[PDB]
Write a protein that binds this ligand. Sequence first.
Ligand SMILES: [Cl-]
Ligand SMILES: [Cl-]
Ligand SMILES: [Cl-]
Ligand SMILES: [Cl-]
Ligand SMILES: [Mg+2]
Ligand SMILES: [Mg+2]
Ligand SMILES: [Mg+2]
Ligand SMILES: [Mg+2]
Length: 424
Amino acid sequence: HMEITTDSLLALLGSEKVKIIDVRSADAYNGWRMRGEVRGGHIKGAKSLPAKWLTDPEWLNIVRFKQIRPEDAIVLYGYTPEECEQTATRFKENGYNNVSVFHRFHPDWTGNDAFPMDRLEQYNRLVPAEWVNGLISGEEIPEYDNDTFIVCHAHYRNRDAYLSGHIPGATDMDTLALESPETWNRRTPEELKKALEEHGITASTTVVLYGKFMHPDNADEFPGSAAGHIGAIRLAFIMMYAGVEDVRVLNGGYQSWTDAGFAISKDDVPKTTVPEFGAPIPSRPEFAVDIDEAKEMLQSEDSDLVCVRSYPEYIGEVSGYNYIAAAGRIPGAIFAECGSDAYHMENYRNHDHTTREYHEIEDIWAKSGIIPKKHLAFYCGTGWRGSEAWFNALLMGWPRVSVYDGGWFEWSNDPENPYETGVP
Ligand SMILES: [Cl-]
Ligand SMILES: [Cl-]
Ligand SMILES: [Cl-]
Ligand SMILES: [Cl-]
Ligand SMILES: [Mg+2]
Ligand SMILES: [Mg+2]
Ligand SMILES: [Mg+2]
Ligand SMILES: [Mg+2]
């Protein structure tokens, strides 16, 4: 495979005929200093294509979907050039003849302030499995300055999602612990305080949330019981609102843990009780928007509601849910199509359930005027997909992002509220 020099690559940055491809993990791409480098993240302009994906049959379709074409001048890099070899070969097997390998990313590029790098601003909230393993193992890990933690396996009324296999020592939290199946909103401060204490969580506990994807099927009574990692990010939103100061989400959920080769447990870990949550609830009320404020936001050039629903929901063909009667949409919201239905987030995720390359999310959002200079309230049917979209924006450092918790459920439950239906 041909080589490209540091000075060459520097001189080509920002040319849209050269495509720089980072074959490290998405977590390293996002900013994690996985090998102790002094500066983490990716070469400015690079795209993420983890070499992990070479063993998935999806690999070539992913490359094409990311608009990487045989006529492009491709530059690969990783922590070492040897870690790019298989990727370079797979590119050449498929007719990509202009592929170079950059050998000097680590430590030459990472170690030199003069060479541009980008990262997900708040990447340390989105943790890799190696970090969780280090935490549970009591090993020295970056981006961690606490002495108290809990790993929590989220599910919706489905303890078998946890009992069938979970991260060692993790305890399970039913989403019903922190949200009401009546309002479908976060529970009251009194209920949240007791639920968090009864799961062993204080405001100063580092909480690591993850869930298990189990292929939600709309034929089933409770499809959300299979959307465990959306549920985990929903709980992360509620905990962050409530006032857990250090909340992490395992990137890609349970699949990232098993893909990393770590041990699986089926033990039913008994919960520890803490006497005091230790902070006022909610300590971050600005993260939640309720319906009166949502109506105000529809009337301002400064703010917008962001509808993270599926297309059949948006045009009012279906409600999206076997527990929501009305079909339709909130007038004036910006559509940010989630994916295929109320329980999938394909447009925000990779095929391995890790978050989609954040620049892609940002670019698609920008085309619809979903931009950080606005106060945005993300929502959906009842707040699950909205919370995952919100979390992605939070990770990018957007300063005024919220979840409009009530969503379409609360909106349509008031017959006085106007709605739209049909193709726009
Ligand atoms: Cl890596
Ligand atoms: Cl370095
Ligand atoms: Cl999921
Ligand atoms: Cl809507
Ligand atoms: Mg340290
Ligand atoms: Mg809600
Ligand atoms: Mg559900
Ligand atoms: Mg106890």
